[PDB]
Curated annotation (Swiss-Prot), chain A:
GO terms for molecular function: RNA binding; structural constituent of ribosome. Component of the ribosome, a large ribonucleoprotein complex responsible for the synthesis of proteins in the cell. The small ribosomal subunit (SSU) binds messenger RNAs (mRNAs) and translates the encoded message by selecting cognate aminoacyl-transfer RNA (tRNA) molecules. The large subunit (LSU) contains the ribosomal catalytic site termed the peptidyl transferase center (PTC), which catalyzes the formation of peptide bonds, thereby polymerizing the amino acids delivered by tRNAs into a polypeptide chain. Its main location: cytoplasm. One of its GO terms (cellular component) is cytosolic large ribosomal subunit. It comes from the Eukaryota. The lineage of its organism: Eukaryota, Fungi, Dikarya, Ascomycota, Saccharomycotina. The keyword Ribonucleoprotein applies. This is Large ribosomal subunit protein uL30A. Keywords: Cytoplasm, Ribonucleoprotein, Ribosomal protein. Component of the large ribosomal subunit (LSU). Mature yeast ribosomes consist of a small (40S) and a large (60S) subunit. The 40S small subunit contains 1 molecule of ribosomal RNA (18S rRNA) and 33 different proteins (encoded by 57 genes). The large 60S subunit contains 3 rRNA molecules (25S, 5.8S and 5S rRNA) and 46 different proteins (encoded by 81 genes). One of its GO terms (biological process) is cytoplasmic translation. Present with 101000 molecules/cell in log phase SD medium.
UniProtKB/Swiss-Prot annotation, chain B:
Present with 450 molecules/cell in log phase SD medium. Component of the ribosome, a large ribonucleoprotein complex responsible for the synthesis of proteins in the cell. The small ribosomal subunit (SSU) binds messenger RNAs (mRNAs) and translates the encoded message by selecting cognate aminoacyl-transfer RNA (tRNA) molecules. The large subunit (LSU) contains the ribosomal catalytic site termed the peptidyl transferase center (PTC), which catalyzes the formation of peptide bonds, thereby polymerizing the amino acids delivered by tRNAs into a polypeptide chain. The modification Phosphoserine is found at residue 23. It is found in: Cytoplasm. There is a cross-link at residue 38 (Glycyl lysine isopeptide (Lys-Gly) (interchain with G-Cter in ubiquitin)). This is Large ribosomal subunit protein uL3. Belongs to the universal ribosomal protein uL3 family. It comes from Saccharomyces cerevisiae (strain ATCC 204508 / S288c) (Baker's yeast). Disruption phenotype: A mutant confers resistance to trichodermin, a trichotecene toxin produced by plant-pathogenic fungi.
Swiss-Prot record, chain D:
Present with 54300 molecules/cell in log phase SD medium. There is a cross-link at residues 124, 130, 148 (Glycyl lysine isopeptide (Lys-Gly) (interchain with G-Cter in ubiquitin)). HAMAP family: Ribosomal_eL20. Belongs to the eukaryotic ribosomal protein eL20 family. Component of the large ribosomal subunit (LSU). Mature yeast ribosomes consist of a small (40S) and a large (60S) subunit. The 40S small subunit contains 1 molecule of ribosomal RNA (18S rRNA) and 33 different proteins (encoded by 57 genes). The large 60S subunit contains 3 rRNA molecules (25S, 5.8S and 5S rRNA) and 46 different proteins (encoded by 81 genes). eL20 forms multiple interactions with RNA and proteins in the central protuberance, connecting components of core functional centers that are located far apart. One of its GO terms (cellular component) is cytosolic large ribosomal subunit. Gene3D superfamilies: 3.10.20.10. Keywords: Cytoplasm, Isopeptide bond, Phosphoprotein, Ribonucleoprotein, Ribosomal protein, Ubl conjugation. The modification Phosphoserine is found at residue 31. This is Large ribosomal subunit protein eL20A. It is found in: Cytoplasm. It comes from Saccharomyces cerevisiae (strain ATCC 204508 / S288c) (Baker's yeast). GO terms for biological process: cytoplasmic translation. The keyword RNA-binding does not apply.
Swiss-Prot record, chain G:
The keyword Methyltransferase does not apply. There is a cross-link at residue 175 (Glycyl lysine isopeptide (Lys-Gly) (interchain with G-Cter in ubiquitin)). This is Large ribosomal subunit protein uL13A. Its main location: cytoplasm. Belongs to the universal ribosomal protein uL13 family. It comes from Saccharomyces cerevisiae (strain ATCC 204508 / S288c) (Baker's yeast). Transmembrane segments: none annotated. Present with 43300 molecules/cell in log phase SD medium. Component of the large ribosomal subunit (LSU). Mature yeast ribosomes consist of a small (40S) and a large (60S) subunit. The 40S small subunit contains 1 molecule of ribosomal RNA (18S rRNA) and 33 different proteins (encoded by 57 genes). The large 60S subunit contains 3 rRNA molecules (25S, 5.8S and 5S rRNA) and 46 different proteins (encoded by 81 genes).
Length: 111, 49, 127, 171, 106, 96, 197
RNA sequence: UUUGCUCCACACAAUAUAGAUGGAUACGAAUAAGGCGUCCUUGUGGCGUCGCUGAACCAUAGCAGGCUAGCAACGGUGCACUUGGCGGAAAGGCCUUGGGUGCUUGCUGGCGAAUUGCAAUGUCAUUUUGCGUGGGGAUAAAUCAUUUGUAUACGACUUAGA
RNA sequence: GCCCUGAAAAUGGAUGGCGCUCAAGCGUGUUACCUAUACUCUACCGUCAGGGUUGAUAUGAUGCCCUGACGAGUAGGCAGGCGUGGAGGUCAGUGACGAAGCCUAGACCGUAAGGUCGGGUCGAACGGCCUCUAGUGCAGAUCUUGGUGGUAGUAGCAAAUA
RNA sequence: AGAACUGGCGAUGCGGGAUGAACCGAACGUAGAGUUAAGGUGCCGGAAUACACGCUCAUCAGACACCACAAAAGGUGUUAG
RNA sequence: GAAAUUGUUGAAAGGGAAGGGCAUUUGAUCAGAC
């Protein structure tokens, strides 16, 4: 895996473009506030922007909110992986590991 | 395994192939080298055995 | 003059032929899947023939439609032909192979009266 | 990559028995932020009874040097691993900035002693403030008065594949 | 005058390909005077014609045309990708193609 | 080396022109008949190709045919060959 | 931009020239290479002579006639290098090799046509100064080429008639250059200079 | 052998294209050196200039390039003739004398274009072959069969035969 | 550290090959670019799952429709279908104005098993559908019987005096 | 030859290691577009005869894991300590 | 009155096999639609 600490811009763009909710074991594009409303309205979540809020500021209902969000299907990075060989650690010139803020650049090229 | 005993090979490999000649008159493939000091003369002649 | 239909896609137009039908005479070209342990056709090695599979299944909106857009219905007499009277825009009649010469004249004349398309109005014509 | 000089300060995690730890500092040459923090933990564990889990990083600050235009002459000490042993070394690089000197050193070691990034320790990089304090000849050469030299046999790069006259290397 | 040319000269290089597999759906085109992807961006979307002769008249001529267009650049050296309505024969690798100026952005 | 040109003599005997025939008994014998017309001029024709061999042709060879009729052989068909001249001054090789 | 490109091969590296030319033929360009005897190969003459002798011992054991052919001409040595950089066994590859002619010296009509060079294959630009290089004419002679003296004689003649052509050319271009200078500083010329001409 | 063969001019067909769409535009040599201009006491000379790419030079306006008028110079170009050379590495091309002829956008005028309809390569190149005309040019061999043995398994070879 | 000595095997030959020497080699760094049945989006096919819809007319509610996810496979299991001989039912089915069979680089349907048509030949029987039944599907078993090739106008047809 | 844990081949194609049951990448309905992996970009061959710092001349150079070999011991060859 | 195998005519291709797959040029032929 490759992971890091994501910013508001990265997370906001992900849900808007590639955010899907787990609706009765079905992968449903959000595409409306009522879809989140009828499914996450118990915890005070009423919108796609509210859902992003519970993600970035880890709230009391982050577990349910994150679980509702379907796992994101990303493509390969647009500009490439930045390295000749992926399966070395980021510290060792590779791709895997913790890239503390450079995940934003990587995910945006994927998104 | 090697030949138990040595012997020179039979025949010459520079006269290959042992085919028929292309003509009844053998061709001269080399004439004597020329020095332009002597009078003009033929270098060969034709006769019958 | 058929009911409107989308663009008809075939996804494959070569006839799938059994392996080595080109090689041996005793091997017919009717399709047979290879069950051999070593077969390069069964293991899908590159450069070899493809095998029939459900991915080549046609669209259901265009399945069974001839290029003119009608579905073939075989008719052997007039009574069969009249069952298509309300279905001229979806079905084209096609006279069965064994119908005699004088009977085809009757069907063809009846077909044009009802406006029913016939796919083979050329068989057994004396001309 | 192209190197940047960072200062990294870390300390052991505070506790009730011993709060206010010593806040050790170290200068690191690294391509990016994550490597600078890593190399600090790598080197610190070699001196003190500490590791990444048992301490914290308090600060990181990139150091870009005062005069990116004045040409310096740097004395550099290293410690590197050969195929058979560990050896110390001292050389000079004459260039415009501290980071470019290290960027020269790593290529220089990789070219002469096949020493890759992993097997090299940069001990200290200092400016030779006084000329005639240079002890190696290859950098002492350029310190003469009114230095000047030509560049013979210049090779032009052609855009088109075919040239319509024989090229000339005057310069 | 002597010259009546309204198209840029070009050569048909090959299909899109790996070293052992090719894609006949995409053709590779070299444009004279184009050496960078930056320069080649000017000819994207231009109409490409392959003109060839034959011994049979079809609709009032013995010249047949395979029409195409330029889709994108290819490589660092000004080569571009093109797709034609019918794939180019591949007997014409190194044959010349005409890159017209329409549609125009000037 | 490559033969630039050949210059032949005005008159050729029968025994030499038999070399150019497979069936001598079936012939108008048509041998150098139009070539003999290259001669019978004062200085026009033959001297050019001779001067061609002067201006070029660092090697000069001579076409000779044997007098096979003098020998007791029953052949009647002479043998033609090139014999290279190894004198000097290739111009006078052509003259000789 | 050219129907036929004729290359002055003197002072070129045989492998880099072969690569550049090989691409030209595969792209549809007709090429003629002249003066193959003055081509260079990087490496001391002794090195390149041993390489040919190691090449010379590779032959079909049971019949030398169907074996690899060791061509000794400088034009043929360059041709062998180019054939290896081309898929010569296919129809497209055979078509490419039809667009190539390699000559020794500068024969007729190519003797009155412009010669170009390929700078990325030129020896004075490629090789480091001081490096040792071999000349194909010398190397070919040591392995069996017979026509070093023939070619040198025919180039001594050709260059003499070529210098005669150029001496007349310089006289005429002086006469034209004088006319343009006199025709300069004219109102027509002033407007031309304003437009960059 | 029932009028055959070859070359020249156009007349129409067939045939095919590894791929014209302004010009393949000519010193040699060196590259830690050269090109050009000029001068002299002619050299391994002096002085001046140039490169840092052909992004050059030439050509290039007109119904796919029409029809007419005038002006200025006596140049430019194409074409068929003609005078004299040069070139053999695969020369097969290069230079040159004279006259004729067409055009000339070097400069200033007059007439025509449309409708291929809003683009459709929108057809202008050269390969070979055939059939016709009209105008010259010239009137053979080889094989089988017979025959020799300097040859020979058979083919093949070498001889002979109006 | 690179390079060299150390460094000897048998058909000619292998950084894959050409070939490459401030590399097209070695160490190292930074960008650009190429392309897998992989990843993202879309269409279409099937499978699985979760749902909607008897309301009147129009008949398949095992139907029509909505949503989502998924798809490699030997041995093997299960399921849905194509074809053959014969049997019950039905199409008051086809047919001497040509049944069945055979042939057809002609057309159409189906992913496929297969199905359908046109043309030629032919001469007396044969199908669709719902079911029933089995001596029901072949590329092979040195399979069985029959038939036919390449070998091949080949080996050869020469003991016993003519 | 014999075991332990795990992953694979068997039963599996596809891109790459020229070539290969086992390595690397990645597992597969039929297509289109885009982007990449491992591997690469003189020519074969799609893709920079890219850019930068050094080193090496080899009268058997060197040239990319598995993997298709080379050691001890030596060298005013050359470079840096 | 099938196939293997064969003759004749017609068409096409053929530098040490042939046959196959994707894609298209060319030639021959052809259905649909109007």
């Amino acid at each position: 895996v490759a992971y890091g600490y994501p910013s508001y811009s990265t997370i906001r763009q992900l849900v808007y473009k590639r955010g899907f909710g787990k609706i009765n074991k079905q992968r449903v594009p959000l595409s409306d506030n009522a879809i989140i409303e009828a499914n996450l309205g118990k915890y005070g979540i009423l919108s796609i922007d509210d859902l992003i809020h519970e993600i970035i500021t880890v709230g009391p209902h982050f577990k349910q909110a994150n679980n509702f969000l379907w796992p994101f299907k990303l493509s390969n990075p647009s500009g490439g992986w930045g390295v000749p060989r992926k399966f070395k650690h980021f510290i060792q010139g590779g791709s895997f590991g913790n890239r503390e803020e450079f995940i934003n650049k990587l995910v945006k090229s994927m998104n | 395994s090697h030949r138990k005993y040595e012997a020179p090979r039979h025949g010459h490999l520079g006269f290959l192939p042992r085919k028929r000649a292309a003509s009844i008159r053998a061709r001269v493939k080399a004439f004597p080298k020329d020095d332009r000091s002597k009078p003009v003369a033929l270098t060969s002649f034709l006769g019958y055995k | 003059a058929s009911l409107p239909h989308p663009k008809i896609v075939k996804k494959h137009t070569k006839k799938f032929k059994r392996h080595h039908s080109d090689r041996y005479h005793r091997v017919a070209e009717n399709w047979r899947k290879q069950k051999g342990i070593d077969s390069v056709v069964r293991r899908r090695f590159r450069g070899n023939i493809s095998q029939p599979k459900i991915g080549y299944g046609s669209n259901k909106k265009t399945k069974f439609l001839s290029p003119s857009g009608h579905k073939t219905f075989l008719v052997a007499n007039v009574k069969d032909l009249e069952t298509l009277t309300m279905h001229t825009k979806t079905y084209a009649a096609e006279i069965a192979h064994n119908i005699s010469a004088k009977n085809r004249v009757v069907i063809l004349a009846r077909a044009k009266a009802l406006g029913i398309k016939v796919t083979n109005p050329k068989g057994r014509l004396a001309l | 990559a192209h190197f940047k000089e960072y200062q990294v300060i870390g300390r052991r995690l505070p506790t009730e028995s011993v709060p206010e730890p010593k806040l050790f500092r170290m200068r690191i040459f690294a391509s990016n932020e994550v490597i600078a923090k890593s190399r600090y933990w790598y080197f610190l564990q070699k001196l003190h009874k500490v590791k990444k889990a048992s301490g914290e990083i308090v600060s990181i600050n990139q150091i870009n040097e005062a005069h990116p235009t004045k040409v310096k002459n740097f004395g550099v000490w290293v410690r590197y691993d050969s195929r058979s042993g560990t050896h110390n070394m001292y050389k000079e690089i004459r260039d415009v900035s501290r980071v470019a000197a290290v960027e020269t050193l790593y290529q220089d070691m990789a070219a002469r002693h096949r020493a890759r990034f992993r097997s090299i320790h940069i001990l200290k990089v200092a400016e030779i403030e006084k000329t005639a304090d240079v002890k190696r000849q290859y950098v002492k050469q350029f310190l003469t008065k009114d230095l000047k030299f030509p560049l013979p046999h210049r090779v032009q790069k052609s855009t088109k594949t075919f040239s319509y006259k024989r090229p000339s290397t005057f310069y | 005058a002597e010259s009546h040319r309204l198209y840029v000269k070009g050569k048909h290089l090959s299909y899109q390909r790996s070293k052992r597999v090719n894609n006949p759906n995409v053709s590779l085109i070299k444009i004279e005077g184009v050496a960078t992807p930056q320069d080649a961006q000017f000819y994207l979307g231009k109409r490409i014609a392959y003109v060839y002769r034959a011994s049979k008249e079809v609709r009032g001529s013995k010249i047949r045309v395979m029409w195409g267009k330029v889709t994108r650049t290819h490589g660092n050296s000004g080569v571009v990708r093109a797709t034609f309505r019918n794939n180019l024969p591949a007997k014409t690798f190194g044959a010349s193609v005409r890159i017209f100026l329409y549609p125009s952005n000037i | 080396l490559r033969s630039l040109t050949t210059v032949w003599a005005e008159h050729l005997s029968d025994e030499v022109k038999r070399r150019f025939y497979k069936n001598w008994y079936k012939s108008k014998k048509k041998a150098f008949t139009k070539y003999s017309a290259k001669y019978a001029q004062d200085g026009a024709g033959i001297e050019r190709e001779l001067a061609r061999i002067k201006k070029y042709a660092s090697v000069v060879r001579v076409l000779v045919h044997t007098q096979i009729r003098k020998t007791p052989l029953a052949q009647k068909k002479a043998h033609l060959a090139e014999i290279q001249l190894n004198g000097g001054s290739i111009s006078e090789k052509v003259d000789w | 931009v050219e129907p036929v490109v004729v290359i002055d091969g003197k002072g070129h590296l045989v492998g880099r020239l072969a690569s550049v030319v090989a691409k030209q033929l595969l792209n549809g360009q007709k090429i003629v290479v002249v003066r193959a005897e003055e081509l260079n190969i990087s490496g001391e003459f002794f090195r390149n002579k041993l390489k040919y002798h190691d090449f010379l011992r590779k032959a079909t054991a049971f019949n030398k006639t169907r074996g690899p052919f060791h061509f000794r001409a400088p034009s043929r040595i360059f041709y062998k290098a180019l054939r290896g950089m081309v898929s010569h066994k296919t129809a497209r590859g055979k078509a490419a090799l039809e667009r190539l002619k390699v000559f020794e010296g500068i024969p007729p009509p190519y003797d009155k046509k412009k010669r170009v060079v390929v700078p990325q294959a030129l020896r004075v630009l490629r090789l480091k100064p001081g490096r040792k290089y071999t000349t194909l004419g010398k190397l070919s002679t040591s392995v069996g080429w017979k026509y070093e003296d023939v070619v040198a004689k025919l180039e001594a003649k050709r260059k003499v008639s070529s210098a005669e052509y150029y001496a007349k050319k310089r006289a005429f271009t002086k006469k034209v250059a004088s006319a343009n200078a006199t025709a300069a500083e004219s109102d027509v010329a002033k407007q031309l200079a304003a437009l960059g001409y």
